[PDB]
Design a protein around this ligand. Structure first.
Ligand SMILES: COc1cccc(-c2c(C)n(Cc3c(F)cccc3C(F)(F)F)c(=O)n(C[C@H](NCCCC(=O)O)c3ccccc3)c2=O)c1F
Ligand SMILES: CCCCCCCCCCCC(=O)OC[C@H](O)CO
Length: 470
């Protein structure tokens, strides 16, 4: 009853505009074929690494899915009758699923290898072998379950092949998951990690944010700055952010300061808080600026050159944020030698280790107060190895080899192309599965369009490599 026309078209006859549309499909077939062909040749002529090893097998599955499904579904078997024989109906139904299982499992193997590469052997080729293995084993049943029926005219269908209704439901469910949904799952997850890396890497201009441009010794830099402002020398914490309520944490710091205000070791501490935003939060800071001469507040925005000034002079960066999935202030800061004190709320949770700063629970004014107190209790011993750890840790987060970087940006493009182009094709597939009478509500122009939109992905893959090839 509720099956899927995987090898059967839905046009009683061929309209003139149908013959126009098949010619237009022939175009996209030709763009795809000659391009993945000319990209395959580029690869062997460039063989006379592993990221090349995987692009060959992806492009090989691209060519294979283009040569099999574009003529089958787009040019030939588009009417409701099967014009070949029973043998070519079981072989072609096999090759159709085989070439699509293979294209997906290649995007899975690349998304998996590159997600690992952000942390030259045999494992490289055992992945793509498994990909061709699974995709050939998963398409096996299509040889037995498809048959040519002539009850009139002939068609290549699964009718009267499964017994119970559950035998067929689980088969088509298995086809959908292992064709699109499960790969999309594995892909989106692996490419989510690569997105975090790229954001950090392409987000720190290390050619600017580095300590080679500073002048002289670090404590000279601090004396000179602390009297530039107009306070005397002491342990220095700094905050630079938008004055926000429930967002960046300036209220937490301010209340933490007022806890630390009438205290025992408050006299040794300097605080430079910087930022503009809501107005009631500035009057709080600026009132602590008149009650205490070791609290400077700067709401005028500064120069790019003067932020690097401070990161490599202050003793600590207080980063009391509520939500910070990337953490670039902490990486600029650490790149210049400053020690971070931040709330474990995202990238700060991942960026600050045990020997690279002090993490605290977010949103608590106290506890931050005790962190600021722990930080000063460990300043009596001169922290030089402590600052080199942040310099090197933040260095790695912000820096990536050029070569491994283009393949990183490449993989994210491959995935987005697959996610974008194949999602409309396959949801109408699952939509049809739940309600077959949905087909009676869709154009021939839009059925044709979402067919072409899907095969934009495999013929633009070669374009994605070439683009990120400088
Ligand atoms: C496990 O399920 C699977 C597995 C693999 C592929 C398909 C698969 C998908 C996802 N779509 C997308 C699609 C629809 F489903 C329904 C409406 C519109 C579209 C559109 F996006 F194209 F607009 C296809 O069109 N075909 C083409 C398929 N006819 C095969 C013969 C060629 C033709 O029909 O001319 C078909 C047509 C209409 C309904 C169901 C199947 C597919 O085989 C599939 F359903
Ligand atoms: C847009 C269609 C496909 C998109 C694939 C995105 C993969 C999902 C991971 C999202 C991670 C994220 O933080 O997204 C934010 C990104 O900076 C958007 O500009």
């Amino acid at each position: 009853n509720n099956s899927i026309p995987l090898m059967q078209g839905n046009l009683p006859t061929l309209t003139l505009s149908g013959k126009i549309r098949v010619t237009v499909t022939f175009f996209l077939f030709l763009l795809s074929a000659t391009f993945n062909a000319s990209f395959l040749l580029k690869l062997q002529k460039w063989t006379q690494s592993r990221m090349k090893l995987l692009l060959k097998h992806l492009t090989l599955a691209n060519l294979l899915e283009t040569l099999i499904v574009m003529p089958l579904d787009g040019m030939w078997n588009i009417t409701v009758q099967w014009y070949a024989g029973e043998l070519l109906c079981k072989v072609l139904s096999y090759l159709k699923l085989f070439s699509m299982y293979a294209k997906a499992f290649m995007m899975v193997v690349i998304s998996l290898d590159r997600s690992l590469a952000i942390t030259n052997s045999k494992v490289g080729q055992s992945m793509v072998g498994l990909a061709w293995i699974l995709s050939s084993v998963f398409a096996g049943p299509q040889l037995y379950i498809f048959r040519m029926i002539h009850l009139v005219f002939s068609q290549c269908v699964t009718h009267c092949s499964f017994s119970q209704w559950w035998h067929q439901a689980f088969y088509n469910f298995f086809t959908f998951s292992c064709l699109f949904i499960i790969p999309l799952f594995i892909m989106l997850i692996c490419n989510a990690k690569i997105i975090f890396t790229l954001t950090r890497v392409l987000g720190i201009d290390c050619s600017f944010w580095n300590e080679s441009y500073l002048t002289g010794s670090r404590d000279e830099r601090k004396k000179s700055l602390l009297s530039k402002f107009g306070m005397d020398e002491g342990v220095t914490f700094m905050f630079i952010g938008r004055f926000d309520r429930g967002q960046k944490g300036v209220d937490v710091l301010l209340k933490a300061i007022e806890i630390l205000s009438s205290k025992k070791e408050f006299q040794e501490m300097r605080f430079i808080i910087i930022g503009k935003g809501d107005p009631e939060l500035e009057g709080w800071a600026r009132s602590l600026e008149e009650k205490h001469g070791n609290v400077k507040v700067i709401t005028e925005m500064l120069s790019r050159e003067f932020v690097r000034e401070l990161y490599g002079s202050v003793d600590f960066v207080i980063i009391p944020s509520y939500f910070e999935p990337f953490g670039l202030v902490a990486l600029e800061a650490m790149c210049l030698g400053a020690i971070p004190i931040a709330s474990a709320v995202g990238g700060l949770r991942d960026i600050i280790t045990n020997e690279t700063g002090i993490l605290v629970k977010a949103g608590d004014p106290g506890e931050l107060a005790n962190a600021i107190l722990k930080a000063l209790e460990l300043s009596r011993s001169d922290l030089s190895k402590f600052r080199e750890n942040c310099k090197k840790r933040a260095m790695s987060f912000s820096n990536i080899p050029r070569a491994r970087l283009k393949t990183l940006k490449m993989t994210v493009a491959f995935a987005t192309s697959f996610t974008v182009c194949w999602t409309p094709y396959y949801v109408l597939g699952i939509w049809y599965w739940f309600d077959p009478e949905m087909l009676n509500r869709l154009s021939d122009p839009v059925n044709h369009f979402f067919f072409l939109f899907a095969f934009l992905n495999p013929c633009f893959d070669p374009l994605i490599y070439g683009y990120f090839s400088l």
